[PDB]
Amino acid sequence: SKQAAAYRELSLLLRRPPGREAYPGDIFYLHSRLLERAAKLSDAKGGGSLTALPFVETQAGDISAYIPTNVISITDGQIFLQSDLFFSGVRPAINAGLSVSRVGGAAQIKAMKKVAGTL
Amino acid sequence: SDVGTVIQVGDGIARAHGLDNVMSGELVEFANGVMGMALNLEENNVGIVILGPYTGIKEGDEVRRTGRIMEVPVGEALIGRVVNPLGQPVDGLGPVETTETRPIESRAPGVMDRRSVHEPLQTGIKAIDALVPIGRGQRELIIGDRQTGAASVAIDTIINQKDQNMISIYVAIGQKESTVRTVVETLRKHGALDYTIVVTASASQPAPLLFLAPYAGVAMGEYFMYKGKHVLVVYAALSKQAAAYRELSLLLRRPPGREAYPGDIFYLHSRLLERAAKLSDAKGGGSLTALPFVETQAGDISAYIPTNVISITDGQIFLQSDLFFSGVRPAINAGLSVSRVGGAAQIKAMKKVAGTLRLDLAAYRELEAFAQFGSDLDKATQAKLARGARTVEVLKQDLHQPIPVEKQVLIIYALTRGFLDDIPVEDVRRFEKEFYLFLDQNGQHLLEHIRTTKDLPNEDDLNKAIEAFKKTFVVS
Amino acid sequence: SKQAAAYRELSLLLRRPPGREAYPGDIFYLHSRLLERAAKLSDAKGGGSLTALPFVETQAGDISAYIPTNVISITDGQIFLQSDLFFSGVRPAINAGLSVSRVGGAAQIKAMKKVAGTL
Amino acid sequence: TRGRVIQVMGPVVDVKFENGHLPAIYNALKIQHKARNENEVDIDLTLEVALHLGDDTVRTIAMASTDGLIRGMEVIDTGAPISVPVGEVTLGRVFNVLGEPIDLEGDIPADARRDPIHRPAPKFEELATEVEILETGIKVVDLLAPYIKGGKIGLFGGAGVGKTVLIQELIHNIAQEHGGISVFAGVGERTREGNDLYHEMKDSGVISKTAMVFGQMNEPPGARMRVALTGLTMAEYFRDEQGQDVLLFIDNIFRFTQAGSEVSALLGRMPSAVGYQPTLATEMGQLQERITSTAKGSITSIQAIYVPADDYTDPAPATTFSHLDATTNLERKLAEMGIYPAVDPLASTSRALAPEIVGEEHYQVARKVQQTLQRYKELQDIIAILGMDELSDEDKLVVHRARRIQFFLSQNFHVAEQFTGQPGSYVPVKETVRGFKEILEGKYDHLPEDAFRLVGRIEEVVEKAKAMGV
Amino acid sequence: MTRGRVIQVMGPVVDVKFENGHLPAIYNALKIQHKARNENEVDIDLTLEVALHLGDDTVRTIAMASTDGLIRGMEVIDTGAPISVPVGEVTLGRVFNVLGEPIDLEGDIPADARRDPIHRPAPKFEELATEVEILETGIKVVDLLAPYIKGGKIGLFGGAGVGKTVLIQELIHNIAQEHGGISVFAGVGERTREGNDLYHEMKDSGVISKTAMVFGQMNEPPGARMRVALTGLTMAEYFRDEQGQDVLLFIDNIFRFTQAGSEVSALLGRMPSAVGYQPTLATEMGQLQERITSTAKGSITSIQAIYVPADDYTDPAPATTFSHLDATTNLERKLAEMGIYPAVDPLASTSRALAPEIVGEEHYQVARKVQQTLQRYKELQDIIAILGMDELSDEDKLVVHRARRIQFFLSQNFHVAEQFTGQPGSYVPVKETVRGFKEILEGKYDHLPEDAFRLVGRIEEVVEKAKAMGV
Amino acid sequence: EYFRDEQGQDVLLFIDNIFRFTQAGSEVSALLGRMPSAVGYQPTLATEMGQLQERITSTAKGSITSIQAIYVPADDYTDPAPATTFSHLDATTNLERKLAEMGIYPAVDPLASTSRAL
Amino acid sequence: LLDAKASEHAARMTAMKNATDNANELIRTLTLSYNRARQAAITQEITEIVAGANAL
Numbered sequence A, C: 001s002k003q004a005a006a007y008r009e010l011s012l013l014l015r016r017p018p019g020r021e022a023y024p025g026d027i028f029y030l031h032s033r034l035l036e037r038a039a040k041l042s043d044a045k046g047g048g049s050l051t052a053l054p055f056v057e058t059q060a061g062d063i064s065a066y067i068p069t070n071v072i073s074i075t076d077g078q079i080f081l082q083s084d085l086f087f088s089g090v091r092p093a094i095n096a097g098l099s100v101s102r103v104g105g106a107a108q109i110k111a112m113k114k115v116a117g118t119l
Numbered sequence B: 001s002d003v004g005t006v007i008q009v010g011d012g013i014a015r016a017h018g019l020d021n022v023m024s025g026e027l028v029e030f031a032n033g034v035m036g037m038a039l040n041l042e043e044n045n046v047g048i049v050i051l052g053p054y055t056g057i058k059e060g061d062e063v064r065r066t067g068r069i070m071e072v073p074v075g076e077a078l079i080g081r082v083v084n085p086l087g088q089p090v091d092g093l094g095p096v097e098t099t100e101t102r103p104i105e106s107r108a109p110g111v112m113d114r115r116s117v118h119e120p121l122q123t124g125i126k127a128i129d130a131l132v133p134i135g136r137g138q139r140e141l142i143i144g145d146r147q148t149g150a151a152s153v154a155i156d157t158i159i160n161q162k163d164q165n166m167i168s169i170y171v172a173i174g175q176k177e178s179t180v181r182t183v184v185e186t187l188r189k190h191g192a193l194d195y196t197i198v199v200t201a202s203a204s205q206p207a208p209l210l211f212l213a214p215y216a217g218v219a220m221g222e223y224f225m226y227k228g229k230h231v232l233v234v235y236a237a238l239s240k241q242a243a244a245y246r247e248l249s250l251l252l253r254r255p256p257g258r259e260a261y262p263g264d265i266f267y268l269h270s271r272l273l274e275r276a277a278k279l280s281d282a283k284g285g286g287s288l289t290a291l292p293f294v295e296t297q298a299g300d301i302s303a304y305i306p307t308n309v310i311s312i313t314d315g316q317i318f319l320q321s322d323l324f325f326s327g328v329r330p331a332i333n334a335g336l337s338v339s340r341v342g343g344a345a346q347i348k349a350m351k352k353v354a355g356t357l358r359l360d361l362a363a364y365r366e367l368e369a370f371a372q373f374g375s376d377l378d379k380a381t382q383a384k385l386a387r388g389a390r391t392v393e394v395l396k397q398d399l400h401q402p403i404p405v406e407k408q409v410l411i412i413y414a415l416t417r418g419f420l421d422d423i424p425v426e427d428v429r430r431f432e433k434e435f436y437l438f439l440d441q442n443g444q445h446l447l448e449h450i451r452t453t454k455d456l457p458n459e460d461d462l463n464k465a466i467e468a469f470k471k472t473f474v475v476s
Numbered sequence D: 001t002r003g004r005v006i007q008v009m010g011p012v013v014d015v016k017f018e019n020g021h022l023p024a025i026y027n028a029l030k031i032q033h034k035a036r037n038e039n040e041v042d043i044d045l046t047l048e049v050a051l052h053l054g055d056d057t058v059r060t061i062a063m064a065s066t067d068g069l070i071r072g073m074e075v076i077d078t079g080a081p082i083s084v085p086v087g088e089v090t091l092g093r094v095f096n097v098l099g100e101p102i103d104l105e106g107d108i109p110a111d112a113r114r115d116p117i118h119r120p121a122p123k124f125e126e127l128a129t130e131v132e133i134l135e136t137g138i139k140v141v142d143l144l145a146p147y148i149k150g151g152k153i154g155l156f157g158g159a160g161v162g163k164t165v166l167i168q169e170l171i172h173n174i175a176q177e178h179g180g181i182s183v184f185a186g187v188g189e190r191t192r193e194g195n196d197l198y199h200e201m202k203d204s205g206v207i208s209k210t211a212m213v214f215g216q217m218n219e220p221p222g223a224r225m226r227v228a229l230t231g232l233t234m235a236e237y238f239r240d241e242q243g244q245d246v247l248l249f250i251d252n253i254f255r256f257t258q259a260g261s262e263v264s265a266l267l268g269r270m271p272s273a274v275g276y277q278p279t280l281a282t283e284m285g286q287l288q289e290r291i292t293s294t295a296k297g298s299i300t301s302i303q304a305i306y307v308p309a310d311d312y313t314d315p316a317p318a319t320t321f322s323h324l325d326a327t328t329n330l331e332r333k334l335a336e337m338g339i340y341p342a343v344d345p346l347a348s349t350s351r352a353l354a355p356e357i358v359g360e361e362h363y364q365v366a367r368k369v370q371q372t373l374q375r376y377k378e379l380q381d382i383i384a385i386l387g388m389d390e391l392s393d394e395d396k397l398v399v400h401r402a403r404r405i406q407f408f409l410s411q412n413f414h415v416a417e418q419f420t421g422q423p424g425s426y427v428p429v430k431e432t433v434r435g436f437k438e439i440l441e442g443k444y445d446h447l448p449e450d451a452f453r454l455v456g457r458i459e460e461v462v463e464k465a466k467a468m469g470v
Numbered sequence E: 001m002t003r004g005r006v007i008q009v010m011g012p013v014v015d016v017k018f019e020n021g022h023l024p025a026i027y028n029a030l031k032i033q034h035k036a037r038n039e040n041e042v043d044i045d046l047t048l049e050v051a052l053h054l055g056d057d058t059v060r061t062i063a064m065a066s067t068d069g070l071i072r073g074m075e076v077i078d079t080g081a082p083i084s085v086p087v088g089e090v091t092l093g094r095v096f097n098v099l100g101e102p103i104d105l106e107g108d109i110p111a112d113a114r115r116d117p118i119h120r121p122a123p124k125f126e127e128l129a130t131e132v133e134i135l136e137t138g139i140k141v142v143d144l145l146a147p148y149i150k151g152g153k154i155g156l157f158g159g160a161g162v163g164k165t166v167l168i169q170e171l172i173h174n175i176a177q178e179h180g181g182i183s184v185f186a187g188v189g190e191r192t193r194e195g196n197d198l199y200h201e202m203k204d205s206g207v208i209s210k211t212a213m214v215f216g217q218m219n220e221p222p223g224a225r226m227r228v229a230l231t232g233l234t235m236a237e238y239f240r241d242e243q244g245q246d247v248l249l250f251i252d253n254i255f256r257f258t259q260a261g262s263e264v265s266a267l268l269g270r271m272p273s274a275v276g277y278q279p280t281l282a283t284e285m286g287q288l289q290e291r292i293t294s295t296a297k298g299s300i301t302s303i304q305a306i307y308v309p310a311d312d313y314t315d316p317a318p319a320t321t322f323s324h325l326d327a328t329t330n331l332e333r334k335l336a337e338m339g340i341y342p343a344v345d346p347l348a349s350t351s352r353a354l355a356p357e358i359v360g361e362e363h364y365q366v367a368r369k370v371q372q373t374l375q376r377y378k379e380l381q382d383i384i385a386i387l388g389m390d391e392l393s394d395e396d397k398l399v400v401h402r403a404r405r406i407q408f409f410l411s412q413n414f415h416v417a418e419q420f421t422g423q424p425g426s427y428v429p430v431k432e433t434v435r436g437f438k439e440i441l442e443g444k445y446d447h448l449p450e451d452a453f454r455l456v457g458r459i460e461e462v463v464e465k466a467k468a469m470g471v
Numbered sequence F: 001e002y003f004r005d006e007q008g009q010d011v012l013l014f015i016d017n018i019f020r021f022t023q024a025g026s027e028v029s030a031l032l033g034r035m036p037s038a039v040g041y042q043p044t045l046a047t048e049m050g051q052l053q054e055r056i057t058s059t060a061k062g063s064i065t066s067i068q069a070i071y072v073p074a075d076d077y078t079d080p081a082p083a084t085t086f087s088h089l090d091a092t093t094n095l096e097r098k099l100a101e102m103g104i105y106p107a108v109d110p111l112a113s114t115s116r117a118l
Numbered sequence G: 001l002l003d004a005k006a007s008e009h010a011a012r013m014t015a016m017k018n019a020t021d022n023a024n025e026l027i028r029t030l031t032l033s034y035n036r037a038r039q040a041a042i043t044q045e046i047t048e049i050v051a052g053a054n055a056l
C-alpha cells in the first residue's frame, strides 16, 4: 500500500491522468508484475520455489477499497487481522471468517489435516 | 482549392490541410470512397469526422469537397426497409430508390408554426392511456430498469398503430445487431414492419454514425410531417448517442466539462427533440411524436443525461423493479410519472372517467404508507384505502395484450362509479376479463357509441348493463 | 465567500493553477491577511482595538464548503443559528451547544461572569 | 470597415479586421452572403463581439446556426450593440432575440425608436425602497411567502415540480388586474409551452398590453444568452419613459447561466467549480441589477429558477438567492404525495412576512402554521417505528392537525384543469388566514383529512366532507 | 524501402518514422529484430501494432511485449498485414500466446499452415440467427432465475474473491464434456498459476484434445492483454464459419481487456474520460463483442467473467458491457460472506430473458413467486435490523420464515468445490428445481430447521439432511 | 537537533498543529501547479511528512521526542492527513472536559499508547 | 398478575437495550460510508477541474 502511494506520487508528477482515488490506471499492473514472479517451478526447471507474503494496510477494516481489492484479485488468498480482536487481548487476531487459503490446503501434512477439520 | 490532404488519422477522426471553400457541416469524401463531415474549420486545418471504416485511410491521401451540407435520403421507398444512418440498406433487398434528400440539421418550428396538442395516441396500455396519456405531437420519455418491460412498451405502441394511419421510424442507437434483427422479425410478423422504416447504428459502428442516427431518423420523419402525415419516432438508448458525442469531442480535443461530457451535451438532445411538434392548420396539420427510451442501472434517476432528457421532454413514464417484483405489471410509478399535456390528449369519455385518477392514486400511495404505522382508522379513510386497492388491481395488464380505448373507459367507469366496491380485491382481474366477454356478447351498442362519438354512452343504460353483468358474476 | 469568488474569477482569467474548488493556492492567505488585522493593541501602542464580525448565509446547515472551513479555522469562534430552532419558537435561534467563543470569560464583566456559569 | 472569417467552431467565430478599426466589445456584426455558385448556401447571420485577440482579431458569439459559413466571408461592423424597438409598437407583438417580430402580423418600420441591449444598472441614489404586499390569491404564498410590489420573486425547484404551472397561474391571477404593462421572456424552455401561453393571452385579451420575447431550447447559446436582455430592455423603456408599473415574467433564468457555460470553453476560459464559467456571479449580477424599481417606476419581477438535481448548493441557485426579495421553494416529496402546488412552507423565509405588515393578525397564524409543520418533520422518523403508538396520545394531536394543515395548503388552479378535472379557485388573504386559524383552533378536527385536498375556501372543505357522507 | 526507424519510446508506445508514401495501414504488424552489435546493447525480438497516423511520416504503435532495451534509430520492418495466427484442426489440443505461437512445448506449427488476421468486421445484419433455446446447466439458481441462452452471451459480474472463476469452472465441468462440438478457452489478465492448473485438469480430461487454449495473463504488458481476446475469437470464428460447428467460448476476465486499453490510451495522447478510462471505451468493447454472435452457418455460446473494480457496479467498464449480454448473473460479497454459494443476487438475472417463452407457463409462475418473496423480505430487512422479528405482523412473519428457506435452498454444492470441502457436488435438473421451489412456496417443509436447506441438491436431500441432524 | 547532536542530551519538541503544516504544503503544491492527489492533497504528502518526522529519533548521543497536536479535518480519521500522521505515532494522550469538570487534573485518558509503548 | 407485571417491565427493558445497541452500530457503519462518499466526491470534482484546465 505504501509502494502504491509512492508510485502514484511519481505518476502525478509526470502528469499522467489519474483515475479512481487518484491512482493511475497502471496500478494493477504495478503489483501484478511483482506478485506474478513468485512460483513453484516444475522438475524440468529445477524444482525451486518462491513464496510471497505482501502486507496491505486498510483504513477502517474496509476490504472493498481499490488497492485491497486489487491485491485480493492478484494473490491466492488472504489472512485478515481485526483491530478489535487485537485490542481485546487476542493479539494473533485472525478473523477466521474472512480469511482463506486457496491453494494451501493440499500442502498441509496429513497429521494436521486429520485434526484441523473438527477445530 | 477544392481538395485537401490528410495530415492525421486515428480513432475515426482525421485532419486535412486545405479545402479552402469547405463549409461548416459539409460532406467530404476520401479517396477510399468513404464519407466524412467537416466539424471544425481551424485557421490552417479542418477537423473531419469519418462516416465509415477508417483503416483504409492513410496520411497523405486526398480528400474532396462535395458541395452538399450533411444530407439524408427521404421518401416513400424507405418504408419496409432496414437502413443505415446514411440511407444505405442493410436488409439485403436491393436499392431503396428514393428521389430527394433533407438536411440532417434543420430548424425546429417556431412558436407561431404550431398548434396545441389535442388528439390522442393510443398505446393500448391502460396505465399509460389513463394516467399518463400521450398525444400527437408530444414527447414522452420511457425510462425503465432492464428487467421491467420498458423496451417492449414502445414496440407494443408501434404495433398498436396498425389501423390509425401513422408512419413509424424505429431508431436503434448503439444497440446489439442481433437485437435489431430480433426487433425487425417481430415487426415483420406483425406486418407493422410494412410501415416501420427502421434505422440501425449497431455498437460496432464508428462513433460518428451513432451520433448521427437520431438526426437521420427525425429528418426522414419530418418529410412526411410537413406533407401532412402523422409520424411516430422511437429513440433507443439515447444515452449511447451522448457517449458517442463525448467520444468525438474528446478525440477532437475540446476540453471536457461535467464528468467528461462537453458543455454542448444538453443542446445536442434539445435540437433533436424540439423538432417533434404538432403543426398548425395553416401548415398542413401534420404531426410528429417522439418516444425516447432510457434504461437505468439499479433505477438511478439522478443520472446526468437522463435528467437532461427529463428536462427536455413533455413527461416521463417510470417503471421500477421493486414495483415489478411486488406484482405490479407494468411497473409504472404513479407519483414519479407525469404528462405535461394530460387531459387534452384524452377522448371526451376518458376525460370524464379518468380525470383525477393519477392524483387519487398518488394520494392513495401516501395514505397506504402512513396507515402501516397508524394504529387506528375510520370509515372514510378505509373507503379510500379499498378504492385504491381496487384501482391498483384494475391497472394491471399482461405484456403484448392491447385493449381498445372503448373497453378501457368502460372498465374505469365501473371502478370509479363504485360498481366494484363489493367485489373482493383478489377477484377484480377475473371480473374484468369476464366483463369484456360480456361486453362483446351484449353491449355492442355501447361499444359502437363510444367508438363513433368519442363520448360516454347513456348513463342509465350503462348502469343497467353493469348491474346485469354483476348479477351474472360469481365471486370466489 | 463572495470576495473569494471574485478573486477566483480574476485568477482563473489570468490563467493561474486551480485548487480545491478552482480556488487559487493563496485563497487561505487572502483571508488570513484580512482577518489578522483585527487586534487589541498594547498600551504602549495606544490601547485601541478592532474587532471583526464576518457573516455567512448557509443553504441548510452545511458548513462543509471550502471557504467556510477556512474562515472557521481562522477566527476565534462562531455563532450558529438553525432553522429547526427558529421554527420551533426559539428566537434568536442560537444553538448554544455548537457555538463557541475562545476568549469567553475574559470578555465579560464581573457580574455576568458570576451568574453565567450556572446558566 | 470590413473583416473576414478565420475560424468556425460551432457557435464561436473568429474575425480579422484589416485597417486597425477593430469593433468594440458587445458590438454586433453582420454576415450577409448570397451564394456564388451551386456549391454554397445563402447566409444572413449576426455575431456579438466578445473578446479581442492579438493580430487584429476578435472572438464573436453567433446568434444563429453557423452551418454554411466559409473561411473568407465578409463581415460588417454595425458600429453598436444589438438594438431592439421600444414603445407602444412592441405591445401585442412577439419578438426574437434580435427584435424581429416572429408573429405573422407584419414588420416594424425602419425609422422607429430602437434601443441597445447592453446598459449600466441604476445607481444607489435612484432606487425605490418601500414594501407593499401583492395578493396572488394562492393560499400558501399569501400566508407563507408574500410577494412584494416592485420586488423580486424567485420560484425554485427541480425538474417537473410545477414551476411553469405556477408561473401561468400567477399570470392568470395578476396580469388582468394589473394597470400597467406585462412582459414575458421565454429563455431556453419549451416552444409548445410558449405557443400555449400566447394563445391563452390572446383568448383572454391581455395580449393587447403584453410584449413577448422567446428564445427557446432549440436556439444556439447566443440567443439563449441575449433573449433575457432583449425583454429587459423592452421593460426598462416602459419603466423609464412612461413611468409605468411593469410586470416582468422570466421563465427559467437558469438557462441564461447554462448558455454562458456552454460557450465558455470555446471562448477559452478555464473551468470554475462544478464546471461553470469563472464569470458566473459577475455575468448574473450584470443582468439581475438592471431588474429593479426606481423613483420613476417599478418592475415587479417573477422568475422561475431551475435547481439542477434538487441540490440547492449548486452555484447557479446559490448565487441567485442573493438577488431575491422573496422565494418559493417547491418540493418533490409533496409533488409525489400529490400536494400541488407543492411549495415547501419553511424555505420561503416568508421574507415579506417581515413582521410589521402581517404582524398583528397574519404573522401569528403564519408562524403557528410553520411551528406545527416543523414539529411534524421531526416526528416523521420517530412516527414510523416507536412513534405511532407512543406519539398516539400527545403528539397525535400535532400530527392530526399537521396532516390537515398540509392538505389544506394545496389548491386547485385555473390553468391546471387539464390535470385536475376541476375549475380553479381564487382565495383572498382574509379567508386564508381565517381558515387556517379555524383549523388550528380545532373547529374541523372531525372532518376526514381527504376533504381538505385541492379546494379553495374552508366552506368548500365542509361541503366536500358533506358529499363524502360525513 | 519499406523500413522505418524508432523515433520515440514511451513505455508500451513507440513512434516509428517511415519513408514518404510507404506508411503502413492502421492495424499492420511491425517487427524489430536487432542483434546486439556491442556490449552496451542487448538483442531484441519485438512486434508492434500500428495505432495512429501522427503526421509527418510518423506512426504511433503499441508494443506486444516489453520495450526495455530499445534505442532511437533501430530498424523497423513492415509485414504488410495485421497480426495473423494459425487456424484449423491444427489448433486443437495446443496452447498459444497473443501472437499465435504455441507455448505447450509440443513443437512448432508448420510455416505454411493457414493463418487468419486478428482484425475483421462483424457479421452482417442479414446473416445473423435469432432463435432462443435454453441451455441447462444443473445450477438451481441459474436454471430457475437467470437461464442461459444457447448461442447467446452470458456475463458473470463480481468483485474480488467472490466466485467468478469457480462458477466458470463448474460450467466447464457441467457443459464441455457433453457439448460434442469444438471449444476455446481464452485467459485474459488472470493468474498464470490458474492457466497451468486448468491445462492439467483439461489434459487428463482429454477434453484438452478438442478444447485447448490461448493465454495472456497479468504478467504481460498492456499490448498483449489488449489482443489475446481477439486471437481466441479468431480461432473460434474459423470453426463457426468454416465447419458450421457450435462453439463454446470461455473468457476468464473481459474487464482486464478494457483496463489494458485504458493503460495505453494515456500514453497514446488521448484526453481522459470519466474515471480516467479511454474515450473510446464503448467503441472498442462493441467492436469486439459484436463478433461473438451466431450466424446461420454456426453458433457461438460465450461465457464471460466480468470484474467490477471495487464492489461498484456503476464503474464504466461493467456498465458498458451490460448492453451486450443475453444473460447476466451478479455475485455479491454479502451472500458470499453469509455462506451462500454460488452467491448470485437473484433479481438482476436478465430475468427479462427467462421470462417469456420457455418458462412462461410452468416455470415462470415459480420463478416470479420466488422473486416476489425475496423482494418483500428485502423490504423488511431494514426494520429487522433495529428491532428484530418481534414487531412484525403475523403474516409478515411468514414471509421471513419462507424467504430464509428459499434463500438457503438457492445455494448448492459444486463438483469443483469438493477440493475445498470433502462434500461431492450435485447436478440438479430444471424440473426438480421447479418442483422443490414449488413445495417450499406451498409450505410443505415449513417445519424443518433452516440449516437443512444449505448446500444440497434436490429437495429430498433437505429432508434426509434434517433427519441426519436429528429432526 | 543542535542540542541532540552537540550537547548530547534528550530534547523535547512541541508542534502546535501538524495539520496546518500539511495544509500549507498543499497550498504550496497548488501554487507550483502540481496535479492534486486524492481528496485534493499534494502528491508528495507522505514524502513531506516522512522527511519531517524521520528527523525526530534517538541516536547514540541523545534523542528528540515530540508532542504533536493533530486536527482531524472532519472528525474523519481515515482522511489522508490524519492517516499519514497516525502512521508515525508511538503514543497518544487525550484530555477530557468531563474530568476537568470533576476537578481531576491533568484530565488525561490516553488509551492507544498502552498497546505499543507500554 | 404481580409476576406478569414484573416480567413485562424486564422484557421491555431488554428489548430497548438491544434496540439501542443495534441503532448505535448502524450509526457507526453509516458514518463510515458517508465519509467514503465525501472523499470520493472531492477527488472526482478536483480531477475534473484540473483535467479541463490541462486540456485548455
Ligand SMILES: Nc1ncnc2c1ncn2[C@@H]1O[C@H](COP(=O)(O)OP(=O)(O)OP(=O)(O)O)[C@@H](O)[C@H]1O
Binding pocket: A072, A073, A074, A100, A101, A102, E158, E159, E160, E161, E162, E163, E164, E165, E166, E167, E341, E342, E414, E417, E420
Ligand atoms: N461455490 C463455492 N463453494 C465453495 N467455496 C467457494 C465457492 N465459490 C468460491 N469459493 C471459495 O471462495 C474463493 C473464491 O475464489 P474464486 O477464484 O472463485 O473467485 P474470483 O471471483 O474468480 O476471484 P479473483 O478475481 O481473485 O480471481 C475461493 O478461495 C474458494 O475457496
Ligand SMILES: Nc1ncnc2c1ncn2[C@@H]1O[C@H](COP(=O)(O)OP(=O)(O)O)[C@@H](O)[C@H]1O
Binding pocket: B338, B339, B340, B341, B342, D157, D158, D159, D160, D161, D162, D163, D164, D165, D166, D340, D341, D413, D416, D419, D420
Ligand atoms: N397545480 C398543479 N395541479 C396539478 N398538477 C400539477 C400542478 N403543478 C404541476 N403539476 C403537474 O406537474 C407537471 C410538471 O409541471 P411543470 O409546470 O412542467 O413544472 P416544471 O416547469 O418545474 O417542470 C405538470 O405537467 C402537471 O402534471
Ligand SMILES: [Mg+2]
Binding pocket: D163, D164, D189
Ligand atoms: Mg417548466
Ligand SMILES: [Mg+2]
Binding pocket: E164, E165, E190
Ligand atoms: Mg478469478
